[PDB]
Design an enzyme around this catalytic site. Structure first.
Site, mmCIF file in Angstrom:
data_model
loop_
_atom_site.group_PDB
_atom_site.id
_atom_site.type_symbol
_atom_site.label_atom_id
_atom_site.label_comp_id
_atom_site.label_asym_id
_atom_site.label_seq_id
_atom_site.Cartn_x
_atom_site.Cartn_y
_atom_site.Cartn_z
ATOM 1 N N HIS A 35 46.524 45.450 -17.793
ATOM 2 C CA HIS A 35 47.111 44.197 -17.323
ATOM 3 C C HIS A 35 48.588 44.124 -17.668
ATOM 4 O O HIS A 35 49.410 43.658 -16.862
ATOM 5 C CB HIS A 35 46.391 43.013 -17.960
ATOM 6 C CG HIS A 35 45.187 42.562 -17.197
ATOM 7 N ND1 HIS A 35 45.099 41.315 -16.614
ATOM 8 C CD2 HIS A 35 44.027 43.196 -16.911
ATOM 9 C CE1 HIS A 35 43.929 41.198 -16.010
ATOM 10 N NE2 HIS A 35 43.261 42.327 -16.174
ATOM 11 N N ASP A 54 49.933 35.984 -16.285
ATOM 12 C CA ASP A 54 48.644 36.636 -16.098
ATOM 13 C C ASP A 54 47.537 35.605 -15.911
ATOM 14 O O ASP A 54 47.606 34.487 -16.430
ATOM 15 C CB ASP A 54 48.307 37.517 -17.305
ATOM 16 C CG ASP A 54 47.154 38.433 -17.030
ATOM 17 O OD1 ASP A 54 47.388 39.532 -16.489
ATOM 18 O OD2 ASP A 54 46.010 38.043 -17.334
HETATM 19 C C1 LIG Z 1 39.824 44.519 -19.603
HETATM 20 C C2 LIG Z 1 39.804 43.023 -19.288
HETATM 21 C C3 LIG Z 1 41.244 42.585 -18.967
HETATM 22 C C4 LIG Z 1 38.898 42.711 -18.008
HETATM 23 O O1 LIG Z 1 39.313 43.425 -16.827
HETATM 24 C C5 LIG Z 1 39.515 42.560 -15.707
HETATM 25 O O2 LIG Z 1 38.229 42.077 -15.363
HETATM 26 C C6 LIG Z 1 38.227 41.047 -14.381
HETATM 27 C C7 LIG Z 1 36.701 40.502 -14.211
HETATM 28 O O3 LIG Z 1 36.039 40.438 -15.255
HETATM 29 O O4 LIG Z 1 36.323 40.215 -13.063
HETATM 30 C C8 LIG Z 1 38.768 41.622 -13.025
HETATM 31 O O5 LIG Z 1 38.953 40.575 -12.107
HETATM 32 C C9 LIG Z 1 40.171 42.300 -13.258
HETATM 33 O O6 LIG Z 1 40.551 43.016 -12.102
HETATM 34 C C10 LIG Z 1 40.035 43.359 -14.428
HETATM 35 O O7 LIG Z 1 41.303 43.840 -14.782
HETATM 36 C C11 LIG Z 1 37.423 42.992 -18.366
HETATM 37 C C12 LIG Z 1 36.966 41.985 -19.438
HETATM 38 C C13 LIG Z 1 37.731 42.147 -20.790
HETATM 39 C C14 LIG Z 1 37.227 43.464 -21.401
HETATM 40 C C15 LIG Z 1 37.429 40.938 -21.777
HETATM 41 C C16 LIG Z 1 35.994 40.658 -22.176
HETATM 42 O O8 LIG Z 1 35.042 41.308 -21.649
HETATM 43 C C17 LIG Z 1 35.655 39.624 -23.168
HETATM 44 C C18 LIG Z 1 36.578 39.037 -23.958
HETATM 45 C C19 LIG Z 1 36.135 37.796 -24.797
HETATM 46 C C20 LIG Z 1 36.125 36.434 -24.040
HETATM 47 C C21 LIG Z 1 35.593 35.255 -24.901
HETATM 48 C C22 LIG Z 1 35.615 33.932 -24.092
HETATM 49 C C23 LIG Z 1 34.077 35.509 -25.327
HETATM 50 O O9 LIG Z 1 33.242 35.607 -24.396
HETATM 51 O O10 LIG Z 1 33.785 35.583 -26.539
HETATM 52 C C24 LIG Z 1 36.528 35.142 -26.125
HETATM 53 C C25 LIG Z 1 36.686 36.444 -26.934
HETATM 54 C C26 LIG Z 1 37.011 37.718 -26.092
HETATM 55 C C27 LIG Z 1 36.757 38.960 -26.986
HETATM 56 C C28 LIG Z 1 38.488 37.737 -25.618
HETATM 57 C C29 LIG Z 1 38.837 39.083 -24.960
HETATM 58 C C30 LIG Z 1 38.058 39.288 -23.621
HETATM 59 C C31 LIG Z 1 38.643 38.302 -22.587
HETATM 60 C C32 LIG Z 1 38.300 40.798 -23.078
HETATM 61 C C33 LIG Z 1 37.890 41.797 -24.171
HETATM 62 C C34 LIG Z 1 39.800 41.076 -22.771
HETATM 63 C C35 LIG Z 1 39.996 42.335 -21.878
HETATM 64 C C36 LIG Z 1 39.275 42.126 -20.521
#
Ligand SMILES: CC1(C)[C@@H](O[C@@H]2O[C@H](C(=O)O)[C@@H](O)[C@H](O)[C@H]2O)CC[C@]2(C)[C@H]3C(=O)C=C4[C@@H]5C[C@@](C)(C(=O)O)CC[C@]5(C)CC[C@@]4(C)[C@]3(C)CC[C@@H]12
Ligand SMILES: O=c1ccn([C@@H]2O[C@H](COP(=O)(O)OP(=O)(O)O)[C@@H](O)[C@H]2O)c(=O)[nH]1
Length: 490
Positions: free
Chosen positions: A15, A117
């Protein structure tokens, strides 16, 4: 006059570099750009910013120190695969603490618009307080977002039982069939915490001025129009962003960073080398790595394998070091243990095809490099991106993965060497069907290069957006003149 913009990228690697490249594209076309970030994230792209300011674009970074979080060691400011898993929520917590500092910086810099973002949904409210437009940068393809909207609207997965029964995604311009196991956890059944985050993000988008995608019209323009009607919003394709601002070799070499592979490539004949990479976030378990290693060795073909994040010891690293010894004995394989210079490798004439997890950036970069794909989706929106690649534009073949998994788990599925080998054999085997596929991706490669040249589809969309934003800036200036004249009369 001259538009001023503040860009706020996220802190995951893929990103970060996509939104930084969008910032560099705006500065290439006359905008005075400031990128707000933290030191460890700036390290990944400050070099690119320095090259650009030398072409006398007005673009700079503004470094904000990352907050103190209990139990978070100094220097941990990024959400990537090398990050220890227990630190992730702390890193995300520190990013959340920065929101008020970001907003103060907006009020201090007084830009004409902001570009942020998707993972900052509050930024639409910040922009409304300042009375300026907010653009949101979305990851991935218009196709994937159209597919998500079809799932949310029509719930085709609710009308099936079992996990092998396919269903169509209703309303899409193309017939697209998926199983419930190929959908993200947060879309399938009852909401989870990510379902609610995505809801907040989509609500923010609907209130925003418009969205920016790294896409180009010849690839999926039907879905760009579909998406705008599905959301009721404005949107612009401004890709391929990697090509647009990284046409120089020095830029390709440094992208997202912090010669031996290039010499090795120089020794091979054209289109003879398979490039294998699963993006910036993936971590495979040893048993999966074993199947890939055997498939690559048994294929007979030359290959570069970007191994990604590996568990130490008997968790994978020992096996791969032994495998690496084996494949150097024959000069057929080359393993890259760290960050690979992906753009430099894909453009090399020796590379002939790509095994990809269907991360959208790699798909776009492979299309520009005119490389057919073997598709191996894993998490996020990658299973939707595979449908576009395989079924709609027909520039890849699937390895046959059946089940979506989260990015931080290994899942239950192991893709077997025979199925990997079938995809490699098609891509590298010289058969007539693969040659027709190479011709299709070549057509799209020419289209990518035209899209960002003067009056290409992406060039024009960016030009139209910048003109709208100039218009908004001028309207506010002329409104102030009108108000002052009215106060004079009284
Ligand atoms: C790599 C991308 C950027 C993404 O990648 C993007 O995914 C989008 C999608 O998911 O559709 C697509 O639209 C886009 O193109 C693609 O780049 C895939 C999903 C994710 C791996 C995502 C995740 O899994 C879960 C969490 C949790 C959310 C939360 C609320 C919890 O639940 O505890 C709080 C704590 C916590 C650890 C915050 C961090 C995130 C947001 C985290 C690790 C950030 C990186 C993220
Ligand atoms: O060793 C690596 C791995 C990835 N990339 C770059 O990182 C991005 C990966 O993004 P993608 O959408 O393909 O997948 P994700 O990392 O988001 O899962 C692309 O720009 C690649 O060129 C790179 O330069 N070297």
């Amino acid at each position: 006059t001259v538009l001023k913009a503040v860009f706020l990228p996220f802190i995951s690697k893929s990103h970060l570099i996509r939104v930084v490249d969008k910032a560099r594209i705006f500065a290439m076309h006359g905008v005075d750009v400031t990128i707000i970030t933290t030191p460890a994230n700036a390290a990944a792209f400050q070099t690119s910013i320095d090259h650009d300011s030398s072409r006398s674009r007005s673009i700079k970074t503004h470094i904000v120190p990352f907050p103190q979080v209990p139990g978070l060691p100094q220097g941990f400011e990024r959400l990537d695969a090398d990050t220890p898993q227990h630190l992730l929520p702390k890193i995300y917590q520190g990013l959340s603490i920065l929101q008020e500092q970001f907003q103060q910086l907006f009020r201090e810099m007084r830009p004409d618009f902001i570009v942020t973002d998707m993972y900052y949904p509050w930024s639409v409210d910040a922009a409304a307080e300042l009375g300026i437009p907010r653009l949101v940068c979305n990851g991935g393809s218009y196709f994937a977002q159209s597919a998500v909207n079809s799932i949310e609207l029509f719930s085709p997965q609710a009308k099936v039982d079992s996990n092998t029964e396919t269903f169509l995604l209703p309303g899409l311009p193309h017939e697209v069939e998926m199983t419930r196991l190929q959908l993200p956890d947060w879309l399938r059944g009852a909401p989870n915490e990510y379902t609610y985050l995505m809801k907040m993000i989509k609500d923010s988008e609907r209130k925003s001025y418009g969205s920016l995608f790294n896409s180009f019209y010849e690839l999926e323009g039907t879905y760009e129009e579909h998406y705008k009607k599905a959301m009721g919003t404005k949107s612009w394709s401004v890709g391929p962003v990697s090509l647009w601002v990284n046409q120089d070799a020095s830029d390709k070499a440094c992208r997202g960073d912090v010669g031996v592979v290039l010499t090795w490539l120089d020794s091979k004949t054209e289109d003879s080398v398979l490039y294998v990479s699963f993006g910036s976030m993936n971590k495979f378990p040893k048993t999966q790595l074993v199947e890939i290693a055997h498939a690559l060795e048994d294929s007979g073909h030359d290959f570069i394998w970007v191994v990604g994040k590996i568990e130490e010891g008997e968790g994978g690293a020992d096996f791969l070091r032994e495998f690496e010894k084996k494949v150097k004995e024959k000069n057929r394989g080359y393993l890259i243990w760290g960050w690979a210079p992906q753009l430099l490798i894909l453009e090399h004439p020796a590379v002939g095809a790509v095994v990809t997890h269907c991360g959208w950036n790699t798909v776009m970069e492979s299309v520009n490099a005119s490389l057919p794909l073997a598709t191996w989706p894993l998490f996020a929106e990658q299973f939707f991106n595979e449908k576009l690649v395989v079924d709609v534009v027909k520039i890849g073949v699937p390895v046959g993965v059946k089940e979506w998994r989260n990015w931080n788990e290994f899942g239950d599925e192991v893709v077997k060497r025979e199925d990997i080998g079938k995809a490699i054999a098609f891509l590298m085997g010289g058969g007539d069907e693969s040659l027709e596929m190479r011709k299709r991706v070549k057509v799209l490669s020419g289209a990518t290069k035209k899209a960002i040249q003067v009056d290409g589809s992406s060039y024009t969309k960016l030009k139209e957006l910048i003109e709208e934003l100039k218009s908004i800036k001028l309207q506010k200036v002329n409104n102030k003149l009108m108000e002052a004249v009215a106060l004079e009369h009284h």
